[PDB]
């Protein structure tokens, strides 16, 4: 059973914390764990005017969001990796499970 788990979040430091904890857990559980594949991050750029009406110097904002996505690959049966993945999930980090 080849299994893929995706660690997609908005904040990056809690993402590094949970990915390091998952890699450490797969290391201590005597399991063949692959390295964390770092996908190219996606920048959310939409610009708008400052003032609500139409007068003033034409000044704009640059609002930004960065979403980071990570990949961890394992070779393990289903129930043990469910038991691993259902431990200590952050509210700002979303995990999703896929099977090949």
């Amino acid at each position: 059973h080849r299994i893929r788990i995706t660690l997609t979040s908005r904040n990056v430091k809690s993402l590094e914390k949970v990915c390091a904890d998952l890699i450490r857990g797969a290391k201590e559980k005597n399991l063949k764990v692959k390295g964390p594949v770092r996908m190219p991050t996606k920048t959310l750029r939409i610009t708008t005017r400052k003032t609500p009406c139409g007068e003033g110097s034409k000044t704009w904002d640059r609002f930004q969001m960065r979403i980071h996505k990570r990949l961890i690959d394992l070779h393990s049966p289903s129930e043990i990796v469910k038991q691993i993945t259902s431990i200590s999930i952050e509210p700002g980090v979303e995990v999703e499970v896929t099977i090949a």
């Binding site: 908005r10 959310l44 750029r45 939409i46 708008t48 005017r49 400052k50 609500p52 904002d61 640059r62 609002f63 930004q64 969001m65």
Partner: protein, 55 residues
Amino acid sequence: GHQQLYWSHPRKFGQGSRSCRVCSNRHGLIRKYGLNMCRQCFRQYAKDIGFIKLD
């Protein structure tokens, strides 16, 4: 024929088919990534969405 001529006008497409989902106005809509509001409401509620003006 009040029932059949009250709103027989097709608002299938066009600008008035969509509206702001915060304050229901039809000017300056942002449709990108499905926000579906005007610019003022997005600027007022932009912090809880998570958009920061870092750049």
